[PDB]
Amino acid sequence: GTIDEWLLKEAKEKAIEELKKAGITSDYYFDLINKAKTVEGVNALKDEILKA
């Protein structure tokens, strides 16, 4: 709703694109970045998956 949430909304979508390239399909962990009401969360959560 907010500008910060709009940026975070973009952060959520943009970040996982790498995981899609990485062959990751786990919807579970993709959900966690949606729980990641912070931008730092989305990166921190994914970090484990990206470096899996």
CB of 11 closer than 8 Å to CB of 39: yes
How far apart, in whole angstroms, are the C-alpha atoms of residue 10 and residue 4? 10
Q: DSSP letters along 1-41, please?
A: --HHHHHHHHHHHHHHHHHHHHT---HHHHHHHHH--SHHH
How far apart, in whole angstroms, are the C-alpha atoms of residue 50 and residue 5? 23
Domains, the chain, with CATH or none? 1-52 (1.10.8.40)
15 Cβ neighbours under 8 A, 6+ residues apart: 33, 42, 43, 46
Q: Tell me the two tokens of residue 47.
A: 């970090």
Task: Compute CA distances 52 → 5, 20, 24, 47, whole Å.
Answer: 27, 13, 10, 8
Q: Tell me the two tokens of residue 8.
A: 């975070």
Way it was determined: NMR
CB of 28 closer than 8 Å to CB of 48: no
- Dihedral angle over CA of 20, 1, 31, 43, nearest 10: 60
How far apart, in whole angstroms, are the C-alpha atoms of residue 8 and residue 36? 9
